[PDB]
């Protein structure tokens, strides 16, 4: 029922600081979104129908980055911002948001993490912004080996689909 608040929602979060919405009680049909060539991805993982019965994560990534919101999957996004378990699952949906989330001049709100000691455990999250030394030392940019771990996407409207902004919704099942 409250899916209007997630998709169709104005403001979207960066991948590193992704949102979880809890939905129990409320029952919906799923046919709300079942029928739309607005969605570019929509790969499901272990299901597809309606038995009438739930977690919904959302965030924005680059076009090529969508690959990585599937069980297994390479890294950076899956290593460092958002990991899906190999086990459990529901579905993963994406749509192109060039018009919204990108500008002629270039849009830079949307961020991601590319430096981290360790990999995320599925559904884990890291909102730390601590200058990164590949040894655990303290820091002071750009002290030869000190970098900030967060990178700006920088979505312009005239980039390859690979580099255009995409919104994502992951529906975990419980």
């Amino acid at each position: 029922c409250p899916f209007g608040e997630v998709f169709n929602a104005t403001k979207f979060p960066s991948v590193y600081a992704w949102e979880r919405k809890k939905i129990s009680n409320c029952v919906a049909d799923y046919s709300v979104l079942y029928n739309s060539t607005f969605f570019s991805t929509f790969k499901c993982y272990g299901v597809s129908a309606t038995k009438l019965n739930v977690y919904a994560d959302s965030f924005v990534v680059k076009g090529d980055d969508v690959r990585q919101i599937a069980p297994g999957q390479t890294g950076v996004i899956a290593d460092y911002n958002y990991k899906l378990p190999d086990d459990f699952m529901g579905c993963v949906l994406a749509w192109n948001t060039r018009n919204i989330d990108a500008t002629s001049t270039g849009n830079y709100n949307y961020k991601y993490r590319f430096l981290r000691h360790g990999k995320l455990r599925p559904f884990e999250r890291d909102i730390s912004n601590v200058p990164f030394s590949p040894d655990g030392k303290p820091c002071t940019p750009p002290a030869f080996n000190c970098y900030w771990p967060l990178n700006d996407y920088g979505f312009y409207t005239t980039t390859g689909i690979g580099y255009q902004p995409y919104r994502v919704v992951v529906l975990s099942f419980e």
Binding site: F114, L115, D135, P142, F144, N151, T159, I161, G162, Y163
Partner: protein
């Protein structure tokens, strides 16, 4: 941790930071080259210098990681590239000074115009005007005048600067552990580690000179031929066993004998291989042209142009109101952004050009998955060569038929083919000795082998020996003819034009064999041949990533540069030339002159 793993974690911040900061400069550059404003041209300088700044920062930052203690090649390559002192290794004076010399040369070359003694009120510059004379005028004097003026006015002005230039540049070069500035340039072709595929800054000169020999027979014969063809045009002005007067070779420097076609055509009675007529008749437009080029690549197993290519590119001139600079170019902006800027006219020439430039694009895409610093043709020669194969396949009468541009029932006279080939030779083969000689002299200047006071002596000594041309007027050190030519007086390695030119044959050949082509090598069109595409794409997807020697292997199955393919492409012409030269003399006296009367 380890300096390796900790270098990986530098390049990674570098790529994904450079990529964006570069896309800044491209988007700017692009705005300008298309909506030429004062507003725009200034932006083109902001991110433009912010780039140079970002670079110098990261260059000196990258120095921090010791070249020595590394082993993941890919990383060593990237680091090497980035740690490029260049200007830094100098003083503060002896660096801005160099910089000074450069820009002045650039501008004086671009801004130099010469004055008509027979009418002082009209005075044009190289392009057009002078270039126009050299290309068209059939008047000995008119020609001799342009040629001389140029090398005399702007030639001399550049002499002092060029003298100063060679020092600071060598000073620079030697400081970075190079034998000379030449040794710096040859640098481009170097490869270390990677056994079986190595190459040194000596192996080049060795290989260029070795290759250049086998051309001679062919060259001397083309030479011999045009010579006699020229005598006819300029009767009494030419010796039947002498060099060719430098001012009668169709352009200012004689770099290409293209324009001599009108005078040297084997069979002037045969007509157009030109569908400019037939294209405009079937009401083709810009779109159709590129949409065709698109089809051509897809045909061999390559991808459609990107949606972004169609909706972002500029395939047509907007005329006035929005004035744009129209030199045809492919753009690899980064961020999956690929564009052509081409002010298209519905002409065969343009139709071909579109196949060339869209070739660069296809290369640019191929190597896009490579990290930023490795996105780039294997060597300075690779990108232009790929470009050129495309026009090779597209220009075949076969391809032109199978497309509805060439009227169905047109046959090929062995005479139309000899025509076309001669055409090619005037350009492809004329420019070769010219090229190799040019950069030999440059090389030798940098190896400190030509004394200041014997600069022009040695220039023309070699134009006579190597190229078979002579000066209409004698030239002391007051002049400086080598710098009369863009590439030289604008600090650009010219040898690329030699190697590319070879590759581009080794390539087209390999590809026809693989496309299974049956006729003369020059009748070859690789269309519809997916099997051949695969083999090309094999080197394409590499970028600067593997050594160029390996890169070459993937395509032609060999580890080095080979000229045989080029000579093959000129077999039916070469034999026919030996025939026409029956009674002609083949070779030249270095001793004869146009002058001294």
């Amino acid at each position: 941790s380890t300096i390796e793993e900790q270098a990986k974690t530098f390049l990674d911040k570098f790529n994904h930071e450079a990529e964006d900061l570069f896309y800044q400069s491209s988007l700017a550059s692009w705005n300008y080259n298309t909506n030429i404003t004062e507003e725009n041209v200034q932006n083109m300088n902001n991110a433009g210098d912010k780039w140079s700044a970002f670079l110098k920062e990261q260059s000196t930052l990258a120095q921090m990681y010791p070249l020595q203690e590394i082993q993941n090649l890919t990383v060593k390559l990237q680091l090497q590239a980035l740690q490029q002192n260049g200007s830094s290794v100098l003083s503060e004076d002896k660096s801005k000074r160099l910089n000074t010399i450069l820009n002045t040369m650039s501008t004086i070359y671009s801004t130099g115009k010469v004055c008509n003694p027979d009418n002082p009120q009209e005075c044009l510059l190289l392009e057009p005007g002078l270039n126009e004379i050299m290309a068209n005028s059939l008047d000995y004097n008119e020609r001799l005048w342009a040629w001389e003026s140029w090398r005399s006015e702007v030639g001399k002005q550049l002499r002092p600067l060029y003298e100063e230039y060679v020092v600071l540049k060598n000073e620079m070069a030697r400081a970075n552990h190079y034998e000379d500035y030449g040794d710096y340039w040859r640098g481009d072709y170097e490869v270390n580690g990677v056994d079986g595929y190595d190459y040194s800054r000596g192996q080049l000169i060795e290989d260029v000179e070795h290759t250049f020999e086998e051309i001679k027979p062919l060259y001397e014969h083309l030479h011999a031929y045009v010579r006699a063809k020229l005598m006819n045009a300029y009767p009494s002005y030419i010796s039947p066993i002498g060099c060719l007067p430098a001012h009668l070779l169709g352009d200012m420097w004689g770099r290409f004998w293209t324009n001599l076609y009108s005078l040297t055509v084997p069979f002037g009675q045969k007509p157009n291989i030109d569908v400019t007529d037939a294209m405009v008749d079937q009401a083709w437009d810009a779109q159709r042209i590129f949409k065709e080029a698109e089809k051509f690549f897809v045909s061999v197993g390559l991808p459609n142009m990107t949606q972004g290519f169609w909706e972002n590119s500029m395939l047509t001139d907007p005329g006035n109101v929005q004035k744009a600079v129209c030199h045809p170019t492919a753009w690899d902006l980064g961020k999956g952004d690929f564009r052509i800027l081409m002010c298209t006219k519905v002409t065969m020439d343009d139709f071909l050009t579109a196949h060339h430039e869209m070739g660069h694009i296809q290369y640019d895409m191929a190597y896009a998955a490579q990290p930023f610093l490795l996105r780039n043709g294997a060597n300075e020669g690779f990108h232009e060569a790929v470009g050129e194969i495309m026009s090779l396949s597209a220009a075949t009468p076969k391809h032109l038929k199978s497309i509805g541009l060439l009227s169905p029932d047109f046959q090929e006279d062995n005479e139309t083919e000899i025509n076309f080939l001669l055409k090619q030779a005037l350009t492809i083969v004329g420019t070769l000795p010219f090229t190799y000689m040019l950069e030999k002299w440059r090389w030798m200047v940098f190896k400190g082998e030509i004394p200041k006071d014997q600069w022009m002596k040695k220039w023309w000594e070699m134009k006579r020996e190597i190229v078979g041309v002579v000066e209409p007027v004698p030239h002391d050190e007051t002049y400086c003819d080598p710098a009369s030519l863009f590439h030289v007086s604008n600090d650009y390695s010219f040898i690329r034009y030699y190697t590319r030119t070879l590759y581009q044959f080794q390539f087209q050949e390999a590809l026809c064999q693989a496309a299974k082509h049956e006729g003369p090598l020059h009748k070859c069109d690789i269309s519809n041949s997916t099997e051949a595409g695969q083999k090309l794409f094999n080197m394409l997807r590499l970028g600067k990533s593997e050594p160029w020697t390996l890169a070459l292997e993937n395509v032609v199955g060999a580890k080095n540069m080979n000229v045989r393919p080029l000579l093959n492409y000129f077999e039916p012409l070469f034999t026919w030339l030996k025939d026409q030269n029956k009674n002609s003399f083949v070779g030249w006296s270095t001793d004869w002159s146009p002058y001294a009367d």
